[PDB]
Amino acid sequence: GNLTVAVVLPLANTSYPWSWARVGPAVELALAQVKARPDLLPGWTVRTVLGSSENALGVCSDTAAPLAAVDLKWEHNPAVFLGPGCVYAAAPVGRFTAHWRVPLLTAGAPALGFGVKDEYALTTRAGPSYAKLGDFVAALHRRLGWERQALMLYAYRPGDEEHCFFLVEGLFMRVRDRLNITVDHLEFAEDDLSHYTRLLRTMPRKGRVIYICSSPDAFRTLMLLALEAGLCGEDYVFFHLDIFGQSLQGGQGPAPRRPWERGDGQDVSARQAFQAAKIITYKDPDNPEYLEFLKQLKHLAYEQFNFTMEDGLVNTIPASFHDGLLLYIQAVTETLAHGGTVTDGENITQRMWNRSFQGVTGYLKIDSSGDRETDFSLWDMDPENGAFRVVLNYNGTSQELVAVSGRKLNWPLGYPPPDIPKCGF
Amino acid sequence: GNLTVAVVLPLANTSYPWSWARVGPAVELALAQVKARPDLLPGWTVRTVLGSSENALGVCSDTAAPLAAVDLKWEHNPAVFLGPGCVYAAAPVGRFTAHWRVPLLTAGAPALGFGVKDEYALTTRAGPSYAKLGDFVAALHRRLGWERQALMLYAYRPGDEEHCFFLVEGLFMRVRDRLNITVDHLEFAEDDLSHYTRLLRTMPRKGRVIYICSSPDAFRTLMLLALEAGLCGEDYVFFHLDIFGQSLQGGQGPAPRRPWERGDGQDVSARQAFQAAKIITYKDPDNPEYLEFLKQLKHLAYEQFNFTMEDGLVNTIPASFHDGLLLYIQAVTETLAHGGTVTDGENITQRMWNRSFQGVTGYLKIDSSGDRETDFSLWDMDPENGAFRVVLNYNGTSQELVAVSGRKLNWPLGYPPPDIPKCGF
Numbered sequence A, B: 001g002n003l004t005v006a007v008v009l010p011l012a013n014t015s016y017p018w019s020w021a022r023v024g025p026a027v028e029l030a031l032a033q034v035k036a037r038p039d040l041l042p043g044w045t046v047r048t049v050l051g052s053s054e055n056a057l058g059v060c061s062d063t064a065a066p067l068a069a070v071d072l073k074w075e076h077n078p079a080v081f082l083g084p085g086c087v088y089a090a091a092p093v094g095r096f097t098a099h100w101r102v103p104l105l106t107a108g109a110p111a112l113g114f115g116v117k118d119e120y121a122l123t124t125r126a127g128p129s130y131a132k133l134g135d136f137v138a139a140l141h142r143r144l145g146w147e148r149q150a151l152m153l154y155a156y157r158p159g160d161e162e163h164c165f166f167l168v169e170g171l172f173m174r175v176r177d178r179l180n181i182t183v184d185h186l187e188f189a190e191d192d193l194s195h196y197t198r199l200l201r202t203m204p205r206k207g208r209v210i211y212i213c214s215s216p217d218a219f220r221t222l223m224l225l226a227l228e229a230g231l232c233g234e235d236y237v238f239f240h241l242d243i244f245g246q247s248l249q250g251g252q253g254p255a256p257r258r259p260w261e262r263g264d265g266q267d268v269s270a271r272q273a274f275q276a277a278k279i280i281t282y283k284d285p286d287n288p289e290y291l292e293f294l295k296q297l298k299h300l301a302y303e304q305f306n307f308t309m310e311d312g313l314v315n316t317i318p319a320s321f322h323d324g325l326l327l328y329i330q331a332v333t334e335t336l337a338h339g340g341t342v343t344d345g346e347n348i349t350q351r352m353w354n355r356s357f358q359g360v361t362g363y364l365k366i367d368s369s370g371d372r373e374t375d376f377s378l379w380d381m382d383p384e385n386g387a388f389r390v391v392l393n394y395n396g397t398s399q400e401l402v403a404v405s406g407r408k409l410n411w412p413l414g415y416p417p418p419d420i421p422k423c424g425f
């Protein structure tokens, strides 16, 4: 028989980590591998019927994603959805598919509200989540001894789909649960220098361990302002939540990075200001299978969709769709082997949750709630060269930190600064 | 043949002006009238299929309204949607119907954003709109000579579906388009006594003609504070946007109201504070057909839904569904007389827009944009008795103001206060 796979992704806009111009060859490679392995759905054929989740302007829309999903459901009767990876498009489509009793795979939709599996039954997330980043910092605080207070700033920009609002919402909500610490939750406009001055005035009263979600330019500007304000590294620690490594040119390899450099005269004084800054990115998989998959993905993305892949850390999202789709196909194969159909949403989904799988991105594990366990990296600056390099790797499954071969965190005083000064704030 | 009307309304919750417990008898009376007249749809049969637009908690929601609409569309293939009335349920369902090319009738959904007929094609609003209130105040200002400045407060309450936010949004937008005056629109928390003191401090600098959208209790508690602060009626005038006449015992009939009285000991001091307050409600139709319709609607509602229908000015929403639907039943008849079909949404809709109809609520007119022309009423205090009464009626179609039974506005100084003082603010 056949197994339709409805796809609701941006088909023309090629500026998203999940856009069809980069996820298309991932699914194509996955389906090419399914058809060469007798152990996966013996004799069946897997098809894709693809709709678009973007409006007339060409951007994510919660208005057109459900329309496309309903059209696809009415016409083709899919067995699964590679639902939207976009926070605003994913919610209505996930509610529709939960009402229809159809599984929904996605390597996007990292928002916290999507993880309420009473309203979003049968949906799986094979890619990074935002709440899983609250486990990482919780593991930092236990290791570094901070157990009192923290502050969390998130920038605002008119264009983006409130990326940092959701990022820090998830981080904050999970950090409250894991730790009984006092956290503060602030926002600033990313273009108003008045807001930056106000923020530099404010912080000395609210915390000594600050997590900032902003663009690389805004974080460099904040560091330069803080250095002038006197906010040195013997007191503060600034953590830049740059998940896709945009300030590190992707952060895809061992090359030395120096994100404090712009060649604008003040980059001599920007190296000084970054002595109290560390960067929290996703983890770049090291296995050779990932490199081979990237090598043969970059070629399909050119021959098929006439689009050139950028060679960064956003490729993990195209690879996670491949891994998740293969995991789903294996679950469906087991379900059929136990005498079922490809329409048993509940039986199929409970064979995906709470198990480990071997993909190109490593040996991953979908947790008991359906969300994938995410691994992170912490970058710090070398005292001698001045270049940034990875110093800590966090394994989501076992929930522990590993120091890279011959590296350790660079603290100005040799040890982390306390999160509570001599006489508080 | 058969004509199927799809209904997406609260079927169990009885606390809405459009809830099925009070709109069901209206539609049943309409369909009884259709079946007794050879003029309308000769020989056809009209029948309704019901879906609920409320979630588990029992409140109308934007999550369960489109789900019910999609289920109804896929199962019964309706010719028209007697769509939702909530501002939040009516948007996704309106977009779905616009995408399907199916007309959507509603006497609710007054929000301004629902009147953009490029995104909401084929939808008709046979009931009051919020922007149509901005036509009223403009026609009021021209009559009283105010042409400089205005201020608009709206209350915020956790429970309501941001009723006053949308009311003031529509009013403010339409007043901005139709006048050159400078308008400023604030917000205040309704159950936070600090905000009231803050507002009484603020107002004397930002306006002298104020429109307040709040609950009757909030308006009275704020008028007492205004009297205490010295904001008397020789300078300020306060307009209470109480559209359904909640503060006037429903605002229907000829009896005299006393909205300043609770027997709490401040009645003597509350009658004095209301000398600078006037109330803007909907207009209660004065024709005998409306009274007969109410008489045979209450009995039917009690007999057929075990719900007792207290009289008031919220009964115009049940009666508009009765009118609009009938208007539609006429339009779809004329189409058939020209060789069309019941599924000619575009030709059916343009035969409803920009024409007048004779219903139980008067001789109504649907404007060229599809929204009905609403008539308003202005209530003012009698200087002698101290009881409130209707003193102005506003005809939406022709946009004139009519004094009622030789009545006149009670201005504490004899003429309207200036909207800009001797030396401004």
Ligand SMILES: *[C@@H]1O[C@H](CO)[C@@H](O[C@@H]2O[C@H](CO)[C@@H](O)[C@H](O[C@H]3O[C@H](CO[C@H]4O[C@H](CO)[C@@H](O)[C@H](O)[C@@H]4O)[C@@H](O)[C@H](O)[C@@H]3O)[C@H]2NC(C)=O)[C@H](O)[C@H]1NC(C)=O
Pocket (backbone or CB within 6 Å): A012, A013, A014, A015, A057, A058, A059, A157, A158, A159, A160
């Ligand atoms: C594909 O989709 C992308 C969206 O990822 C479209 O690109 C535009 O991307 C920007 C930011 O990445 C986004 O702001 C645009 O939408 C918003 O645009 C303005 C803001 O833009 C202005 O300010 C920014 C700084 O914040 C300047 O960099 C920019 O030059 C402007 O001066 C908002 O005010 C709007 O309200 C809107 O929300 C986004 N494009 C659109 C139409 O929203 C890209 O056009 C798409 N391309 C194709 C071919 O479909």
Ligand SMILES: *[C@@H]1O[C@H](CO)[C@@H](O[C@@H]2O[C@H](CO)[C@@H](O)[C@H](O[C@H]3O[C@H](CO[C@H]4O[C@H](CO)[C@@H](O)[C@H](O)[C@@H]4O)[C@@H](O)[C@H](O)[C@@H]3O)[C@H]2NC(C)=O)[C@H](O)[C@H]1NC(C)=O
Pocket (backbone or CB within 6 Å): B012, B013, B014, B015, B016, B057, B058, B059, B158, B159, B160
């Ligand atoms: C029928 O529909 C009405 C809506 O018109 C329902 O009333 C609402 O019901 C929902 C859940 O069913 C409930 O969440 C709403 O409460 C809202 O407000 C509270 C805070 O309100 C507090 O103050 C008011 C003051 O009057 C108290 O009455 C109330 O008990 C609270 O102490 C929020 O915390 C909630 O989150 C929510 O936003 C409620 N609102 C109103 C105005 O009634 C009604 O339950 C439905 N009934 C049935 C049988 O379906």
Ligand SMILES: *[C@@H]1O[C@H](CO)[C@@H](O[C@@H]2O[C@H](CO)[C@@H](O)[C@H](O[C@H]3O[C@H](CO)[C@@H](O)[C@H](O)[C@@H]3O)[C@H]2NC(C)=O)[C@H](O)[C@H]1NC(C)=O
Pocket (backbone or CB within 6 Å): A362, A363, A375, A395, A396, A397, A398
């Ligand atoms: C993150 O942690 C996990 C474990 O905490 C690391 O290793 C994996 O651990 C599981 C058990 O928890 C192993 O089963 C898995 O290796 C086995 O996988 C299959 C099936 O068991 C077997 O055929 C293999 O030969 C191997 O025995 C572990 N995966 C490995 C070692 O690759 C995981 O590696 C950590 N993350 C990273 C990036 O290393």
Ligand SMILES: *[C@@H]1O[C@H](CO)[C@@H](O[C@@H]2O[C@H](CO)[C@@H](O)[C@H](O[C@H]3O[C@H](CO)[C@@H](O)[C@H](O)[C@@H]3O)[C@H]2NC(C)=O)[C@H](O)[C@H]1NC(C)=O
Pocket (backbone or CB within 6 Å): B362, B363, B395, B396, B397, B398
């Ligand atoms: C508000 O004003 C409108 C008009 O500005 C009144 O409604 C009708 O107006 C039209 C012309 O604009 C009148 O022709 C109509 O009266 C006739 O309507 C039909 C068809 O023309 C005819 O068969 C009737 O016999 C009647 O002669 C007006 N409708 C009436 C007078 O009922 C409207 O009445 C005004 N509002 C109120 C509350 O009166």
Ligand SMILES: *[C@@H]1O[C@H](CO)[C@@H](O)[C@H](O)[C@H]1NC(C)=O
Pocket (backbone or CB within 6 Å): A354, A368
């Ligand atoms: C998940 O699987 C483990 C075995 O690996 C089991 O012990 C645990 O109970 C499972 N959790 C749930 C929620 O089923």
Ligand SMILES: *[C@@H]1O[C@H](CO)[C@@H](O)[C@H](O)[C@H]1NC(C)=O
Pocket (backbone or CB within 6 Å): B354, B368
């Ligand atoms: C609406 O009807 C009037 C006459 O009632 C007509 O003059 C006008 O052209 C019609 N259309 C518009 C857009 O006004």
Ligand SMILES: [Cl-]
Pocket (backbone or CB within 6 Å): A008, A009, A010, A053, A060, A084, A085, A086, A089
């Ligand atoms: Cl998407």
Ligand SMILES: [Cl-]
Pocket (backbone or CB within 6 Å): B008, B009, B010, B053, B060, B083, B084, B085, B086, B089
């Ligand atoms: Cl509704």
